[PDB]
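Researcher: Please generate the 3D structure of the following complex. Treat every line as part of one assembly.
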Amino acid sequence: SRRRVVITGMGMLSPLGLDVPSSWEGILAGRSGIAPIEHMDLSAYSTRFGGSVKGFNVEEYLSAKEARKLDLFIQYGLAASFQAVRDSGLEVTDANRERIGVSMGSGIGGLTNIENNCRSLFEQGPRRISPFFVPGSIINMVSGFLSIHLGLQGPNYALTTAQTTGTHSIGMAARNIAYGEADVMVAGGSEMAACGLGLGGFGAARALSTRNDEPTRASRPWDRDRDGFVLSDGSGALVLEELEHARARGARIYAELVGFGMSGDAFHMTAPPEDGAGAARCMKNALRDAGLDPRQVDYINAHGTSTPAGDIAEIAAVKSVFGEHAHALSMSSTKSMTGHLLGAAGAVEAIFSVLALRDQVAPPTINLDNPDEGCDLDLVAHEAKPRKIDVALSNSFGFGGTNGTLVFRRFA
Amino acid sequence: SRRRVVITGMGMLSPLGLDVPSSWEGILAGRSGIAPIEHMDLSAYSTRFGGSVKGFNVEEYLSAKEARKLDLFIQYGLAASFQAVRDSGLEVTDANRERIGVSMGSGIGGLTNIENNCRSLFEQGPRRISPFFVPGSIINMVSGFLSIHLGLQGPNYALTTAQTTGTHSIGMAARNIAYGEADVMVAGGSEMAACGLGLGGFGAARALSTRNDEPTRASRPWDRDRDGFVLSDGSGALVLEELEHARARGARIYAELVGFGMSGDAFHMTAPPEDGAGAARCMKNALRDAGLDPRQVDYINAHGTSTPAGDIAEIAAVKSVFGEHAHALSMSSTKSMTGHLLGAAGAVEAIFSVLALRDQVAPPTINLDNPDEGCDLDLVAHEAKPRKIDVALSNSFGFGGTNGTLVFRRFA
Ligand SMILES: CCc1csc(-c2cnc[nH]2)n1
Ligand SMILES: CCc1csc(-c2cnc[nH]2)n1
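Model: Done. Output below.
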């Protein structure tokens, strides 16, 4: 029968920090992680900035010899996973290793490595493709390499659901534990799509902000002057654990994961429906899963991508789900500061939602100077808002009309 | 408790055929689908052959315009999915659309598209990258496009577990139905990695057979002269359905899906452990899940990739799990004919396992001329074997030590 699931460990690389506390400090201070990209020449690109991980040292985690075989998205996913496992205090043993698994996903995976090997193939020939090209690039190898390093013999998989990946990964991992397929899961996502194909491909779709002369103001969810998402890099990982397992070992519990929803829009390959119907169906599924009155929801970490259609669809969905209570909760987009970590967005935002519960504060939506028509909820404009939060919801939406919602609450 | 899950629809593209019955006819005749790769200069490559899908007409499924937006692996996944939904007879309605979902995966995703957009980026710059590059290349777009086309509003996601993808996709879709999150799921996988990057990437790891002179003899699982796997393309999709739902509409039921196992080896990034410990745990997990004794297993569709370490690991795992029953079951590798469809392998091999139950026949392992040291099981060498089959297993083992096992049972 269905078991309860708690969060005992969290790990992160973001444009605001090389771990959770440093990232969260930036979040509560309203700091932007967005800046012109230094790692490549983007003069021919319509977008030349994004949220880079600054000063990442893979030799805090892995030997340089191993690191050279792995795409940055794998290095970032392992860094966050190692932080989360360490933060949990969990000891992996012969007695429990079969009951500990991993589900770390990515939206695009090892695009930098595929681009670099494509350059080798086209300029030199196939004999110059790396022997490590496949295992160092494919999405499942965060889960794979983490399992090999820590000896995790539980369910081992990866999701890829575009901008919903981190949320789906965490929800499905919670279901694994709920249904008894595992007692512990490391789950989240990682992304590093800031290569020519990434910036060029999102640019060709005209999906990205082109505010090159003011990158920190580019990401402006629900602002009338928003012009698309800001592409960002990093990773979030959480240690999910069955409640009685966590209690038995005296784990520190950050919060309980009480609800998960999925729904497909079935609307459009890339565009959300303007009325937010799929996001509303997804939140309702999650609230019913959590056994909640919708009025219990205090804080929503929105998807909040800073796209014209996406941001207004989310307002419509929250009004439709929460009715008059939509005016009482606080909703913010931390993408205002981090940008959009794509497959990692739902993982870092789940962490921010848990910390909103720990610290009783709604992170701000920075840059919300002039809320757009109908964007008249409490969007926590400009500055963090201390408030009562018993229940927090984290939403993600993605290409293919794929929706996820996670519901977290305080654990006493 | 848990609901029962049955297979009511199947669909396929393979190197043997453009649907299930044509593919299955090839399988039972011992036909190879392996041939030198056409319309592609492989002069500089150490492998020049593989399993291509021959004569695929995407305009039976999509307009030319919608097809131009999608990588071949998405086209292939959609073709198998549309076939499987047609084969099931299911009528999607306003009353059931929120209960029908999709989980179609891929191991490597849109390499062909990435390669062609790389060509444009390197030659001409980013402004030649296609606007549909990102949504037309990402792995979750088979689930995305299928849900949009058919109006499916249930759980919408995509697995990517390398060579285990199709097995995990089907198993986790079965869990969605068993635990009441959906009544119907379309599940499986698709792959088209026959680009420079795929043949070059696997070639750089020396993982592929280089038997260019005799492509049809290259895939020879458990044969002492095997020299690695054969890269193949295509897709498999199954309609999974809750039993009472299938019975209420008078569905034709092929078989019941009674068990699903997952395990991680935690051993090596590409190589399985010689003793098959991971595969043994995963099969035992799947049999425990099904409430079946190893003695009840009649037929195993092996992973059987034709790699030195993989094939011998599977013999060891089967001897370990089945003890005095290990010789009584029949175990075959259909990859002897199809080659290795990577993330689609588990999907087309779940279908072949279901048809083994329908037709009471074990498909052959062709090319098994000289079984290797210790390969003395009933590997169905050379010719199909009519026999009693009540319980059939399908195994997949992939990069990162990721394992999956499905258990199917006759339904009457
Ligand atoms: C942690 C496992 C690992 C990292 S890089 C690697 C490897 C490289 N060549 C064989 N194996 N294994
Ligand atoms: C406790 C969180 C944390 C910060 S840095 C870190 C780590 C784990 N392994 C190397 N570094 N864990």
